[PDB]
Design a protein around this ligand. Structure first.
Ligand SMILES: NC(=O)C1=CN([C@@H]2O[C@H](COP(=O)(O)OP(=O)(O)OC[C@H]3O[C@@H](n4cnc5c(N)ncnc54)[C@H](OP(=O)(O)O)[C@@H]3O)[C@@H](O)[C@H]2O)C=CC1
Lengths: 329, 327, 327, 329, 329, 327
């Protein structure tokens, strides 16, 4: 139990939506010795320091594009959770190199620093937009995922495990659509912005995502891309829920947007393993030191999937009606 | 036209490179053709086979911005073909592929803007459409950078476009030559990854010609996609070696069963022409562009809402016998 | 005037930034206003609140010279407001503050010279005068770099000036909003560092207006200091929360009891005008400048040999009630 | 006693005024195993190698702006004395970035290299021009001081202590005013250059500064800014001493110059601790591992100072007349 | 015997002429645990992986100009053979900075990475064009040689030995003249290109060079520049051998070419030591830890040479007639 | 002529530097002379000894490209004299010598091209001919870079030439001053490395004058070699100290017994003039050059097939007494 006692954890992008919730979770449910937040903004860090005001907290101002800073910050760290990223799809289309520097080079630097400091386990956050991506954001995350999975080939004086957690949209994420609509409805709610009527997405709550990352830590061998089984919801039903008696307005598909998202590509189903409530996409490459991904560290058994499996949000077997959504807010 | 123009091609010693250089020397009045690549061996050999005063060779890496800045001085047109393209090797050396393909694209763009290059065409691949392998992901990032670079507006406008096509019949390190080696080496079996494998096929000459036409058509920002045939890998092996049997070696790291050239999710951005497609930019530039009409006054039209250019459902299929005519 | 001019502001999403952008959009004919900062969240929100075609947003870091070189293309005026400004946090993250504030200044200067920007104004702080904290030391280095940059003489002359003023009432992450939060959160006590604490106070609108006038006055090389009121911190808390009592939390890392805007040791360099001061450069440029007469033909005069603009002995004091009118 | 036996010491800027005197002191009064000089100029190093010709000496050509070079040079070092710097006030005003690169980035690199090589103790030289600075030189030194003090927060496999020594003008320093006047008087001595008649400064001899650094090593805990109690002298009395019957000439205040210098800012008196013949300005920040700066490693007791203490050169309690100066030359 | 058992070896430029032969030699004649090829080209590495198809092989795509990549690749390595280089003399004259970056900075990076990873022994390949060089290629190799020899001064937690192997032209080297003529004779053989009639060179076979490097590993102390005793051949006799009845054509001396090559400069004879079939040019500098280069690790005794010794290819005591050459091909 | 020209000299505070600056100030109408070097001490002293408005001092390192890019703005002529030249120390600090001499050359070239400098002359040494020591190897690399840089063809053509000569009598840190120190220090013995030691000798004024003439003659690409006398080291010590005896300390790390200025293997590239030699480039530039005729219409002729300019077989020998006249 509690396989995280007296551990020092560092989370890049710790001031974000996932970050604050993750930090709260670790402080409340684990015996972790220290939690280090690594991010660039002094404003968000100053406010987070006040909000949490916990002696087990440490704040480092730093950029994941800065290898030297990461090298210094990861000293004495046991576990690294990599959540830092530029995630705005349309903005990434207009500022591709910035997204590339943060998401791709950021991954490379975090990996490098974790190896140098002999971190034990590392989990990087992916996204469904990284599966058969069409937008730059997703492309950078795919590169990131490939880097983290591949990093398990290294063999230093100390062993470091690198795994990835991939899930869909986070309900109420910082700068996401949910908060956007709630605000529009709060102001006047005259007409709700709708990209396309066919728009569908996977949905997971902040708590579910955070808990999934934590459990992934407990069962990972290193090299896995963990995918949780989650519900899908149509953007039209989402709007009516956040504003019952309010007219919608089609604004058109934004730059680099998909109508439906994928979490486990059809072309990679042969690498996928199913479990009670989650999947594991095995590495496409072979490590010098093989591993059995069918049995987690929690002794959970997994089975291969069908030769034509495709985990998409358009044909999901589970959904959420406007009433199920409200039960989250 | 390339009349009295100076053209530089990164990765000029490769399969596409040598064919492109030959075509430019023989069919245009380009004043100077610069080859930019790392290997002194290939450049020494290419200088011998292309002993032409119009040629100039620069040893250089696309990961080296200062070197590119120097080499692109006085250049009018830049063709970006340098890349790490072996899918399996990119899976094992992801950062190397990222440095060459992604940072290389960034450096070329930067050097082209600095030297006020007029037109730039970067080579893309169908592996960059809804990619699953690292190589394809790096090319998608490359494509996004080149398209985005059109937002720049310096003293001299620079146009950046992309050319995306499928597998090049018999390219350096590809399957075709590999199968020819086995056949000529008296192999008793032909290694087949998966019986369902399908691919688009374009000849080296077709690719080069398409790139040259793109130069004449481009406004900057387009991803040009040629209409080319597909071919089941089973048929290809059955043609290059009808006798010898085939063994199943299994799908290699990062491979797709079928390739996409125009994703369904990007249908709305596609414009169809008689012999090709243009995938319009997903972003809006400072100055609008009308991609429905090429610089050659060719008119294009939107495709069907459910359209997708895939190799598994292509209306054009390369005949196993007609393939031998290409070899 | 900013008539048909292109202006770029680093740290454009901050308190000064948004107020500056609004003022330029509403009171000038600037053709384009570029916001350059790192956060996609703030830029996405600012784009929504400033849905104006005159706006352009660039995601970028001032620690990134290549990014600045690109973003400043075609820019006429650059306002440098990007910085790490939290005094206590800079003490704990000194190198981070040094990278942003000092190297950031160096990169902006470099990019401005490369792109032949006409005028540049960098924001300074009174914490940079006879500094004791790391933040102030980095701003002093920044100020020195900007003043020194005027020695350059390229194809296009670039003027670099500095604007130095005190605490901005209610700036992002400052005390005022913090006290408002407590008051509206039903706090039973107001945290006071030291009963002797004194500070200069300027409103966001006053700061922005002063920067705009500096642009019209500057020859390049000046450090502009506005004549603004001082205010005992005790009075400020007594105004924002007359009821609730105040607790003494003690002086924070790197704090001064009173701030200086014009050091006594720099008196001889100061020139007084009706509404402001100019601290002349301590160095002599290749081409002399007469700071006694602004570009607006305003005449200034030397100050007293023992002069020093401090917040503890200011002849102007902000009335605790008059402060509420600013809030 | 002799807490420096069999130790390897590296001094950046070892060919300078402080450097040569410091090296001579260590070689003559300690059982140090080896002394490494780290500086850029081959001429000064070649001449110093001949002048000292001591087998315990090692010379490395290198720049403190060069992290890789520092990383290599500090290998196997136990103690690092950082004296390298651009110190010409007016020149720093004209070449601010150069002063910044050497003094600030130089400090960052030395710190980085000392941590990587597990150096035991490090002392960086500050200056009174770093207290409430007005000139760029002083500003860079203040940044340097802040970096060295802050570096004590790190906790690697090995512990490194970082302290700072701050004192006034060094009599006869390389390129300073004393040598300047002596030369003018040697040539013809027609008229002595005087910036301002009110000019006052703190004065310490090369030997006193060097000895102070050495003793600071013996009593430091890491994090301190050591300040020695030293005399003050008016520039007018200084001139008459270096040229009794010679007329002076007011040339005016040079770029970035103060009339009087400060060593312990009034605003930091609350951090200051007084001792028999020196002060300790405690860190403004709190380290994860607290320390008691009231009792040195030499068991010397210190007391807090008055709430309005201000160690300035204009109101010093001790001075030096033209006769006291001559007793130094 | 077999002083290389269970060792991990990394060879930069492993896909080249020397590289493939060296790898074949190690795999066939030693008990080495693993051999890592480090080079840039994916094509050559893909083909070499197929050609060798040995489980003891590992391939890393990487540039010696890339320190971070080298740092990563050399992890866990015991022996490093540095063969990567730009070696085309005329091309180096036209692309001097490229040759400098690869050969000089490449050497610096390899040295740096080997020290960081505590490699035991390192051998860099030199060339006779590095002795009293006139062309840029040779100048860069001379710099490289100086760097490797000098690197023996370092003293880390682990000791690393750095030696250099210098020999003449390799018969049939990739892109060399032999393959060139064979091709011309294969096509039509109308006229053979001849730079100058006086042209002479030292000649060693691929196998001899590779074996020499291996034996050098077994007898090196670190700091040596090993030179093998090899035959000399006139370019005219070389041509007649590769094409008996074919007319030659004088094309003139190419950029940066010598008529005759030197392997042991007259001015360094005082540092040279002779052995049965090889020489050792001792370091020009003195290491903190002296070494006796007169007795190898194989107990082979060496004697100083004459005060006017000059190992040139024009006055060699051994040569190869067109018949001796054919006995190599 | 240097009429109204701006000249920058790297390593301007050195022996060659100060002599060059004095000569330019006194014999030309150069409008501005910029000294670029690292040491504030030497620059402060040089500014005092050269208190002339035509002078300008930049603190900077040739290893710093950005600093060079800035300092060379508006410069017409660049003289590159910065270097690490102590042979023994370069052997012990090889990478340091490589960074300064080789990368320094690369940066100067890069900055000169960027700022469109008209002419550049880099100082070489006879130790760079058939070198055995690291120092000489770095200078050979430097020479190769400068010659090669002439292939560039930007908006403004930049000519790069090299000046190679022997030991400079009494240069900073050289033997002569060292022997003078001993003699004036009442030394009982003079350290001699080897009784066979021979060297070429040129005075500081001769070197400076030759550099100035090279500027007037150069087409770009030449390595200029002056005809100067040789001198046995035994004679030099016998002149500076006839009384005191000499001890044999042995050959120092990296020393040659005799120096070469023009290698036999480069004979075919040499052109002889009345007072000097030109070693033509080993490479062919985009645009040919006729080195047989200088810009001063001086005609040169090829040398003998077996020619080699060495110090051991020089037809000119410095008289031990005639040397004292130089001292
Ligand atoms: N051949 C000869 O006559 C002699 C040569 N030598 C030396 O011996 C060594 C081997 O020579 P040889 O086998 O003939 O030459 P090759 O050109 O056949 O091999 C050179 C190898 O170096 C690799 N390489 C080149 N640049 C780099 C780089 N920047 N980073 C990593 N790898 C690089 C190349 O692989 P890739 O391009 O895929 O990176 C290639 O595998 C060289 O150092 C050469 O100087 C000395 C004496 C005799």
């Amino acid at each position: 139990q509690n396989m995280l006692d007296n551990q020092t954890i560092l989370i890049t992008g710790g001031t974000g939506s996932f970050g604050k919730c993750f930090v709260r979770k670790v402080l409340d449910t684990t015996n972790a010795k220290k939690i280090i937040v690594y991010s660039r903004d002094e404003l968000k860090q100053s406010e987070m320091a006040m909000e949490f005001n916990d002696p087990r907290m440490r704040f480092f101002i730093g950029d994941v594009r800065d290898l030297e800073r990461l090298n210094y910050a990861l000293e004495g760290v046991d576990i690294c959770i990599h959540a830092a990223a530029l995630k705005h799809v349309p903005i990434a289309e207009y500022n591709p190199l910035e997204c590339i520097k943060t998401n791709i080079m950021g991954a490379s630097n975090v990996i490098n620093a974790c190896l140098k400091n002999a971190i034990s386990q590392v989990i990087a956050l992916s996204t469904d937009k990284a599966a058969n991506p069409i937008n730059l954001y997703g492309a950078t995350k795919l590169c990131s995922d490939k880097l983290f999975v591949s990093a398990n080939n290294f063999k230093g004086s100390s062993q470091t495990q690198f795994s990835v957690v991939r899930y869909g949209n986070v309900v109420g994420s910082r700068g996401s659509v949910v908060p956007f609509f709630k605000k529009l409805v709060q102001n006047k709610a005259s007409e709700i912005p709708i990209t396309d009527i066919r728009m569908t997405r996977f949905w997971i709550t902040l708590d579910e995502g955070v808990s999934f990352v934590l459990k992934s830590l407990k069962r990972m061998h290193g090299g896995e891309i963990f995918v949780p089984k989650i519900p899908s919801m149509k953007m039209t039903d989402l709007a009516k829920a956040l504003a019952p008696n309010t007219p919608t307005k089609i604004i058109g598909i934004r730059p680099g947007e998909k109508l439906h998202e994928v979490m486990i590509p059809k072309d990679e189903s042969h690498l996928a393993l199913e479990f009670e409530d989650f999947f594991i996409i095995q590495p496409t490459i072979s490590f010098q030191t093989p591993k059995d991904y069918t049995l987690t560290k929690l002794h959970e058994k997994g089975q291969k999937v069908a030769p034509d499996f495709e985990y998409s949000s358009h044909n999901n077997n589970q959904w959420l009606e406007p009433d199920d959504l409200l039960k989250l807010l």
